[PDB]
Amino acid sequence: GSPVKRFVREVLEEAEEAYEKGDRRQFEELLWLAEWAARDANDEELEEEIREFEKEV
Amino acid sequence: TECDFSPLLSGTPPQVYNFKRLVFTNCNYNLTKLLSLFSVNDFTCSQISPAAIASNCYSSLILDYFSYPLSMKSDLSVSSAGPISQFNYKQSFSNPTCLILATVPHNLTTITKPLKYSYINKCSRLLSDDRTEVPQLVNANQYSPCVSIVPSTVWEDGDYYRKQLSPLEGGGWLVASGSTVAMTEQLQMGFGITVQYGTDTNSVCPKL
Ligand SMILES: *[C@@H]1O[C@H](CO)[C@@H](O[C@@H]2O[C@H](CO)[C@@H](O)[C@H](O)[C@H]2NC(C)=O)[C@H](O)[C@H]1NC(C)=O
Ligand SMILES: *[C@@H]1O[C@H](CO)[C@@H](O)[C@H](O)[C@H]1NC(C)=O
């Protein structure tokens, strides 16, 4: 829907792969990237999407 | 031996963060022959005048060139602290320099248009331990660390880019974001000139 949403959603897809493969370090590195970008773009709706992602994963 | 500016005259010029550099020594230049092919919109120098830049002898002359929109003229200046000088292109502060903004006339068909103008609006390192962002400012006569992750043409204004760094590199992320400006009816370009006076021979001289 927007450049930051597309970027974050690509990052979260990689994070899910990392978490499913048991690479918890990589999962955290990607979550931090995603959180940084959502906050950089002042996208509060996207910040909530990342939270729901973390809860659901 | 005349200084050969012809590489500038063939191809699509890169965006400002991928500026192309020509370096001249031991040759004689005719700046008028070059500039007369273009519609020059602005010609501003630092530590030297536009009249003197085309009449003096140097130990070297450096010409950087790139696509660049006239609407962003105020960001391309020795006095600017904006994103162009922070992340894209920074000229030497210790040598005399000029910046020329010019338009490519329609009959100069060997200089072709990119689909749009692009520039880097952010280049930063993310530090994982402190969760901190450190802007990576470009050095004079160097490319942004982010030129590897920013495409040659940005797809959409505000796109984000990343590279993961190894623990040997400090870990964390290199991140960037790009901005776009719509292409103009005729291509607009920037030219950056840097000259040095040498304790050695001044072998870069005007053609008589
Ligand atoms: C055709 O090319 C000539 C140069 O050979 C262009 O003339 C230059 O045009 C700019 C803008 O009008 C002037 O500032 C330059 O000084 C001109 N140069 C000379 C030597 O006169 C001309 O504009 C081009 N014509 C078209 C239709 O694109
Ligand atoms: C420099 O170029 C101009 C513009 O083409 C030309 O008229 C002039 O004779 C040249 N000067 C030289 C070759 O000394």
Numbering used by the authors:
A (entry chain D): 3 to 59
B (entry chain A): 381 to 588
Which passages does the manuscript contain on this structure?
The best interface motifs (according to ΔΔG) were grafted onto new backbones using MotifGraft32 and designs that bound to the biotinylated MERS-CoV S EMC/2012 RBD via yeast-surface display were subsequently optimized using site-saturation mutagenesis to identify affinity-enhancing mutations. The process yielded three constructs, designated cb3, cb4 and cb6, with respective binding affinities for the MERS-CoV S EMC/2012 RBD of 3.7 nM, 61 nM and 44 nM, as determined by surface-plasmon resonance (SPR). Superimposition of the RBD from the crystal structure determined here with that of the computationally designed complex reveals that the cb3 miniprotein aligns with an RMSD of 4.8 Å for 57 aligned Cα positions. Out of the three monovalent miniproteins designed, only cb3 had detectable neutralizing activity against MERS-CoV EMC/2012 S VSV, likely due to differences in overall binding affinity which is an order of magnitude greater for cb3 relative to cb4 and cb6. The neutralization IC50s and binding kinetics for all three monomers are included in Table S2 and Table S3, respectively. cb3 broadly inhibited MERS-CoV pseudoviruses harboring all S variants from our panel with up to 4.5-fold reduced potency for the United Kingdom/2012 isolate, compared to EMC/2012, most likely due to the L506F substitution within the cb3 binding site (full curves for each replicate in Fig S1). Our structural data suggest that cb3 binding to the RBD would be incompatible with engagement of the hDPP4 receptor. Subsequent local refinement of the region corresponding to two neighboring MERS-CoV S RBDs each bound to a cb3 module yielded a reconstruction at 3.2 Å resolution that was virtually indistinguishable from the crystal structure of the monomeric cb3-bound MERS-CoV S RBD. These results indicate that oligomerization enabled retention of the binding mode designed.
